[PDB]
Amino acid sequence: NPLFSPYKMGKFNLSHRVVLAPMTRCRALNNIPQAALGEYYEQRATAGGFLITEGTMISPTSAGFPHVPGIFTKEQVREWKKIVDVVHAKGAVIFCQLWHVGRASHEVYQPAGAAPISSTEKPISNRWRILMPDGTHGIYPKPRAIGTYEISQVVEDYRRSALNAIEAGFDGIEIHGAHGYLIDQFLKDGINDRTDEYGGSLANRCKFITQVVQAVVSAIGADRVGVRVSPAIDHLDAMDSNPLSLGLAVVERLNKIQLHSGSKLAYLHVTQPRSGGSEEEEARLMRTLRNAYQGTFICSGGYTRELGIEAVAQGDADLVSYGRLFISNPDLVMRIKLNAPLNKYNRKTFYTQDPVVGYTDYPFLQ
Ligand SMILES: NC(=O)C1=CN([C@@H]2O[C@H](COP(=O)(O)OP(=O)(O)OC[C@H]3O[C@@H](n4cnc5c(N)ncnc54)[C@H](OP(=O)(O)O)[C@@H]3O)[C@@H](O)[C@H]2O)CCC1
Ligand SMILES: Cc1cc2nc3c(=O)[nH]c(=O)nc-3n(C[C@H](O)[C@H](O)[C@H](O)COP(=O)(O)O)c2cc1C
């Protein structure tokens, strides 16, 4: 089983290649990590396994989901530390995902009901609705297009949050630049139409992610920094006219940062759209991005035991991250090793607030 051969990612020697994909679950009430998160991440931690936490706020204006944890207050750091200590006690590596939703928010998630921020003033289309704290679905409001001073301050929020994550004991951080959130709202030409230096050309639309990655690398080092993108995913109207060229342009900048900083990033994390008879074309795009990047490649999206085994066997990726199957299988790593049948997941309790129901009450193997 190639999924259980050792792999060295950064300065961390991993015992296997099954990775916990970052997953918002909305159990961190009042944006403070709760003890339920400690139990939840401990259930899934293994000796030498790599975990990525749910998306974590970098500022009071970065949230777009109810009760998502933060890492911008000292109170959040101290609560985050107890969860990291329990995960490390099992011998696992854990990264905190820094997540700014940009325009994918609502006045109920913003201080003083202010408009969310983005690269443009174009709102998300009415085909998509935002989950509200009461379980209903609302309309995405018109975002506010930030200037370059505010851009450098958001970059400052990323750098400040990365240090807070290291202060809490995290092994590193992942930059969430996918799924149509803030960083993706600058990358994709379907959204970014600015006439300044952050929009227009392909290189200009890559400036924001470059400066964010440059800031966290300068603060904590490239070996503790991962980057997640999804150029081929149109989630929340995140459509680019050339997903391959966008991904390649992003990869070339990650390489350039590695050459300049003299160290390699932790990894490149890419999620594919899946979704038919287009499996060969979607696999070619992911392999093209992998072959272009000098470093570790993590593939994500609709992966199974057999699909993940083949991903490492043919060299399409070095690590494979699992999302929904890890929700319903806390011992998913052990189940993949023994080829034991997996349990189904309940979508209704993905985003609920109960600290046990649909969160930590999925049984292990008997
Ligand atoms: N912070 C983030 O980065 C976020 C990432 N997210 C991604 O944005 C999208 C929004 O997801 P969602 O929670 O609003 O529901 P979604 O995954 O899009 O699909 C809803 C329904 O379509 C079903 N569906 C049938 N095909 C499929 C198929 N290829 N794939 C994802 N579902 C499928 C799917 O079946 P499953 O429950 O997954 O078995 C479900 O019934 C997803 O791609 C998700 O990966 C979740 C929200 C947080
Ligand atoms: C409920 C839910 C929450 C998610 N939250 C995040 C998130 O916070 N950050 C992120 O980068 N991806 C998030 N994702 C996407 C997954 O990390 C990953 O891209 C995808 O689920 C992998 O596909 P799979 O579930 O079929 O393995 C989420 C997915 C789901 C279903």
Residue nearest to atom 18 of ligand 2 (CA): 323
Look at residue 139 and give its three-state secondary structure. coil
- Please identify, by atom number, the ligand 1 atom nearest to the C-alpha of residue 351: 13
* CA 243 to ligand 1 centroid distance, Å: 20
For residue 108, which of 87, 80, 131 has the smallest C-alpha distance? Answer: 131
Report which secondary-structure segment, H or E, holds 18. Answer: strand 18-20
* Helices within 169-278 (DSSP H only): 182-187, 202-205, 207-220, 243-261
* CA 65 to ligand 1 centroid distance, Å: 15
The one-letter amino acid at 197: E
Active site residue 303: no
Token couple for 334: 């052990």
* Helices within 262-331 (DSSP H only): 279-292, 305-313, 324-328
The catalytic position among 40, 181, 198, 267 is: 181
The one-letter amino acid at 80: W
The one-letter amino acid at 210: T
For residue 101, which of 38, 152, 176 has the smallest C-alpha distance? Answer: 176
Resolution in A: 2.1
For a mutational test of ligand 1's pocket, the pick from 235, 307, 351, i.e. the residue with the most ligand atoms closer than 8 A to its C-beta, is 235
320 vs 307: CA distance, rounded Å = 9
* Helices within 221-304 (DSSP H only): 243-261, 279-292
Token couple for 229: 């993108």
Residue nearest to atom 23 of ligand 2 (CA): 301
Within its chain, how far is the Cα of 356 from the centroid?
23
Domains in the chain with CATH codes? 2-349 (3.20.20.70)
User: Do 321 and 293 form a contact (C-beta atoms < 8 A)?
Assistant: no
Question: What was the experiment behind these coordinates?
Answer: X-ray
* CA 321 to ligand 2 centroid distance, Å: 10
Token couple for 283: 């696999």
Ligand 1 binding site (Cβ under 6 Å of any ligand atom): 24, 55, 99, 179, 235, 274-275, 302, 324, 347
